[PDB]
Structure formats: C-alpha cells, structure tokens
Amino acid sequence: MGKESGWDSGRAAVAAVVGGVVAVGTVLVALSAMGFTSVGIAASSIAAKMMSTAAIANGGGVAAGSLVAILQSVGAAGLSVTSKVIGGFAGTALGAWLGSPPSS
Known part of the structure; x- marks a missing residue:
C-alpha cells in the first residue's frame, strides 16, 4: 500500500501525531475557537444533538x-x-x- 508516504507508518502514526499534544491544543482551540465564541455556542450545538452537521x-x-x-x-x-x-x-x-x- 502506497510507496513511502511521509514516513511509512500505521499505528505509531498516531504517536507521531501525539508529539506536541499542547501544540494540538492551541491549534484546535485556535481553529475551533477562532474568536471569543465557542462556549455558549458549543452549549447550543450540544443542546441540539444530532441536527445535520452536513454540508x-x-x-x-x-x-x-x-x-x-x-x-x-x-x-x-x-x-x-x-x-x-x-x-x-x-x-x-x-x-x-x-x-x-x-x-x-
């Protein structure tokens, strides 16, 4: 499968993805929380539970x-x-x- 794609790995991959959890946190909160809106909003979407989440x-x-x-x-x-x-x-x-x- 494939031909050496950016360090051939399967499971360990996740591990390589772990290295920098914090970085993953900031990146997330960054993307997700692109602003000062996410809390209440998150409470809204959550309250909804199963709506569409489709594009x-x-x-x-x-x-x-x-x-x-x-x-x-x-x-x-x-x-x-x-x-x-x-x-x-x-x-x-x-x-x-x-x-x-x-x-x-």
Missing part, C-alpha cells in the same frame, strides 16, 4: 466545513513553517535550535 459539497464527516480550506492552507503552510523551523529540506532536523548559524 452540500463533500457529503458528511471526514472534512466538512469551510475549515477544509483551512486544512489545505494550514496544512501546506503549517507543515511548511513547521519543517522549515525544524530543518530545511530532508536534512538537519531535531536539535537544540539549529537554524542557519554563521558557519563556513
């Missing part, structure tokens, strides 16, 4: 909502600024900060 475009579940656009952007962009801050391009990564120092 006339994809169908339902697995990507559903404008957030999608954010997924594509934040996806590439994010991963970008990410790895970027990490290494640069398949090489030199993971370390006590090691961007591009004055080396010769």
